[PDB]
């Protein structure tokens with residue numbers, strides 16, 4: 001279109017609203033993370049866990065302790081996403097079973113999207129920017145726990161190459177949540193209508209925000225495929241440890257989601 005009219009103004013207002021919700025819902029944004037990660041004289045300096053010795057210092061089997069850290073964080077992450085979901089124009093207006101469904105099947109895609117914010121070539125920022133854990137350390141975890149994040153790193157470096165900002169991600173995450181094709185949705189049409197509008201919002205945001213890159217919209221939409229594969233892969237990984245590791249157990253609120 002390339003026209004500043006009433007429809008385009010609404011799409012900006014929607015972009016602004018989602019951004020503001022995202023800032024309120026999500027405490028460590030991408031902008032902060034990038035700043036910390038690039039040594040942009042952010043308030044304090046995270047402790048770098050690169051081995052067993054460095055981990056014991058910072059922690060002021062490990063494979064189990066770290067795995068249980070990632071489930072605890074995963075739980076809070078769902079709070080954050082629940083709160084953001086509820087800020088999306090038309091969302092609370094939907095059947096409760098649909099709302100609950102969209103989140104059942106959304107939260108992991110969103111989790112692995114946001115985790116990319118915390119990652120570079122070297123590793124991931126942990127506990128709101130106070131720690132950094134290396135990729136090679138996480139790989140070196142006792143099998144099969146060395147296998148979990150490697151694929152998220154592989155996703156992230158591809159994803160981070162798109163160079164999206166918090167304003168981009170805000171709309172993107174909304175688009176993901178309102179996915180018409182989740183199992184056992186009563187009313188598809190109303191969800192698809194919100195997503196069509198979110199997709200208009202995104203296409204506009206990207207055009208305005210990314211002069212120097214085309215088929216960014218498309219390359220971004222393709223990422224939703226990579227996200228599905230990552231979640232699928234992640235589940236077949238959770239499946240295996242439940243057999244092998246018949247000595248531990250996994251937070252029940254996650255178990256509700258992890259059987260469908």
Ligand SMILES: CCCCCC[C@@H](Sc1nc2ccc(NS(=O)(=O)c3ccc(Cl)cc3Cl)cc2s1)C(=O)O
Pocket residue numbers: 063065066067069070071073074111115124125126127128138141145148149152234
């Ligand atoms: C203090 C212990 C450090 C870990 C805590 C997690 C960090 S951020 C974070 N958040 C999630 C959320 C999900 C995942 N899923 S995952 O990548 O497949 C994964 C990688 C390794 C292991 Cl051992 C298990 C798992 Cl599930 C990982 C992470 S890492 C935080 O701020 O607290």
